[PDB]
Every structure is written in structure tokens, then in C-alpha cells.
Amino acid sequence: PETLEARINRATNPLNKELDWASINGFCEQLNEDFEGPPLATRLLAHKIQSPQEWEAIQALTVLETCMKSCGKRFHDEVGKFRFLNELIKVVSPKYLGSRTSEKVKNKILELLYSWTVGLPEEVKIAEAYQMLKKQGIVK
């Protein structure tokens, strides 16, 4: 089967005229398949999400949203590390990348973070990351 790299490259291709579900869901399927899939997925996603090409980053966030819903204790656990969460904090925060990131991209990240605090309460690092942002005034 095709590699995580191949999937995510199709799924987030800024040439895409619409969402490519075969590739989006194929990414989720594939990271679930191989032992070391989830920590790789999370590395690939973090890079796509920090793209200055907005449609690339937006599609990445849709892949992330999708696989969080579909996969996981292993995927949920990787996303729920500071190793990943820090990369999202970079994108939304004026100290880091926030100044040059579209409001669309930042709002999507903040939505996703809220939804995981509600939907995955066992991932306490996601929750900690979110009230840190809220304490800084980046949310509400």
C-alpha cells in the first residue's frame, strides 16, 4: 500500500479542486496499519499544517480532524503530546507563527482544540494547551 507520505501529499495537494476523501481517509487507514504510523503521521501533519500555502494547511487540518474522529488511542495519544501540540501553538500564537497565518487556519486549529477538550477528556495535555491559550487571551 501507498506510504503515509504519498497519501498526505495527495490529500493536501494545493492543486486539489475539492477534498480528496480517498487520500484523506486512506491516510487515516494507513497510519492505523503500521506500528510507527501514528508518530510519523503526526510529524507529516505538523509540517503541512504550518504551510504558508493556505489550501495546503487547511486540507491538512481536515485530515487531522478526520483521523482524530476515525482512529485512535495510538493516534489520539500522539496528537495529545506537547511534541505535536506545540506545533499547533506555533501557528496560532503571535509570539511564533500567528502573525503570518491566516485567521481561517488559526480559527480551525482553535476549533479543533476545543472539540478535543470536550471529546477526548483523557488527553489532558490537549486540555492544558487549550487553557494556556485561553489564559493568554488567544482564545476566546
Binding site: 503530546k81 506537547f82 511534541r83 501540540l85 506545540n86 501553538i89 506555533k90 511564533y96 495535555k125 492544558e128 494547551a129 494556556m132
Partner: peptide, 9 residues
């Protein structure tokens, strides 16, 4: 595995 970065504050 239990290891992780520090929270970026």
C-alpha cells in the same frame, strides 16, 4: 512512551 517536550509557553 511517556516522554515529551515541555509545553511551549
Amino acid at each position: 512512551d511517556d516522554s515529551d517536550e515541555d509545553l511551549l509557553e
